């Protein structure tokens, strides 16, 4: 899928999306959701 | 993070 292998993503029932990266270890509200649409 | 605190990181969070 358009995920990237190094990438971990979950969307939360509030409707936010945070992508943990298990790279750095940190959950990411900073999406590439919101960066493609 | 622009968004409010998001989930403690665990691998795979359940929510």
Known sequence: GP???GWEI???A???V???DHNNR???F???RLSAN | ???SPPPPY???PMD
């Open chain 1, 26 to 28: 940190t959950t990411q």
């Open chain 1, 10 to 12: 979950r969307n939360t």
């Open chain 2, 10 to 12: 665990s691998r795979y």
């Open chain 1, 18 to 20: 945070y992508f943990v």
């Open chain 1, 3 to 5: 995920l990237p292998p």
């Open chain 1, 14 to 16: 509030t409707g936010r």
């Open chain 1, 30 to 32: 900073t999406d590439p």
């Open chain 2, 1 to 3: 993070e622009l968004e």
